[PDB]
């Protein structure tokens, strides 16, 4: 289609202009066409929405950092009402990504490599919900990303080698889910140490095309490990 090839160009253009909202509405219209994504379009969509959802997460963390640093004051009400406004935008963003995954991306999965990628993406965007959920809504969204990460974890160990960047990046995010959402730091470290050790034990079964992006994730795996053991 002449429209899809032009939407990718605008998305690539909006990406360098750091206009991720414009980049996100382009890749959303691309996936709404129904055809399974490239590897290029796939990362374009995730990069776009990770920056859109990332801006609201950064704001939410700062407003809440000020919110609990104060109920004597009466000016706190407006602080909370401004946080739920930011929470409101962040909630609607992740649902659009999650419904994009359920309608188009998860179903039309060619290889297991893309299935693990999209199942991990689902676990990430339910995890961003658990960061801001509270009450009966909280444990329900936690179980949803856990189930997403769990199936992606199972498939990745079945069809991917230990040095695969998608497998390594899933163990990274899954172990972060264990540290921050479940608050099991020992299980989180074991999840990250196992992936790092299985990958460092096969660093001859991968070449120059494989290296790099593979250690960037192993570097992050350890970064968390030494930070969590202290």
């Amino acid at each position: 289609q002449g429209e899809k090839t032009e939407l990718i160009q605008k998305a690539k253009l909006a990406e360098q202009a750091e206009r991720y909202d414009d980049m996100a509405t382009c890749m959303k219209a691309v996936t709404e066409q129904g055809a399974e994504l490239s590897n290029e379009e796939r990362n374009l969509l995730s990069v776009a929405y990770k920056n859109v959802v990332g801006g609201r997460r950064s704001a939410w963390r700062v407003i809440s950092s000020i919110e609990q640093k104060t109920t004597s004051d009466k000016k706190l009400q407006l602080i909370k009402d401004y946080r739920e406004k930011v929470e409101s935008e962040l909630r609607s963003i992740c649902t659009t990504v999650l419904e994009l995954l359920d309608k188009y991306l998860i179903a039309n999965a060619t290889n297991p490599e893309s299935k693990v990628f999209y199942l991990k993406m689902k676990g990430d965007y339910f995890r961003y919900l658990a960061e801001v959920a509270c009450g009966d809504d909280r444990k329900q969204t936690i179980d949803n990303s856990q189930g997403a990460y769990q199936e992606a974890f199972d498939i990745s160990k079945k069809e991917m080698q230990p040095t695969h960047p998608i497998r390594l990046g899933l163990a990274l995010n899954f172990s972060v889910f264990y540290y921050e959402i479940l608050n099991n730091p020992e299980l989180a470290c074991t999840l990250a140490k196992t992936a790092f050790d299985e990958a460092i034990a096969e660093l001859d079964t991968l070449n120059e095309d494989s290296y790099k992006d593979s250690t960037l994730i192993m570097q992050l795996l350890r970064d968390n490990l030494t930070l969590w053991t202290s």
């Binding site: 990274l172 972060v176 540290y179 994730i217 992050l220």
Partner: peptide, 5 residues
């Protein structure tokens, strides 16, 4: 505590 970039 960092996640994937």
């Amino acid at each position: 505590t960092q996640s994937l970039s």
